[PDB]
Amino acid sequence: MDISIISDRNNPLLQRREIKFTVSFDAATPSIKDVKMKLVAVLNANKQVLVVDTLDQIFGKLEAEGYAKIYNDEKAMATIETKSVLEKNKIEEEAEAEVAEE
Numbered sequence: 082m083d084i085s086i087i088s089d090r091n092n093p094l095l096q097r098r099e100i101k102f103t104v105s106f107d108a109a110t111p112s113i114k115d116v117k118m119k120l121v122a123v124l125n126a127n128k129q130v131l132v133v134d135t136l137d138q139i140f141g142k143l144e145a146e147g148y149a150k151i152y153n154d155e156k157a158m159a160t161i162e163t164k165s166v167l168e169k170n171k172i173e174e175e176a177e178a179e180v181a182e183e
Contacts (some may be wrong), residue, residue: 082104082106082111082116082119083094083101083103083104083106083107084102084104084105084119084120084123085102086100086101086102086123087102087103088100090158094156095155095157095161096154097148097150097151097153097158097166098126098149098151098152099148099150100148100149100150100151101122101147101148101149102120102146102147102148102149103144103145103146103147104116104136104145104146105139105142105144105145106129106141106143106145107143108143108158112168112171113133114171114174114175115134115171116133117131117132117133117166118180120133120149120154124147124149124151126151127151130148130151130152130153130154130155131149131151132150132151132169132170133147133148133149133150133169134147134148134149134150134166134169135147135148135169136148141176150166161163169179
């Protein structure tokens with residue numbers, strides 16, 4: 082996919098990370114974790130404690146804008162954040178096989 086970073090804000094107070102960006106694709110609509118994959122390579126951070134907040138598809142073209150979020154410890158987040166934020170974060174992820182990528 083073609084993602085573009087808009088801004089990179091850091092929220093230490095709530096040990097959170099405010100990073101806004103855009104995601105565009107040719108119909109192909111991935112998922113949260115899926116997007117996290119590339120986003121992980123884009124943000125270059127711990128994918129484990131990485132999730133998305135929300136997104137919005139563009140009508141004009143085939144673009145979609147959204148905002149990502151990152152925490153430090155789920156311990157705090159589990160408390161601070163709400164079931165709403167934790168709601169997004171899917172239960173478990175996939176895993177084709179041990180071997181992957183080039």
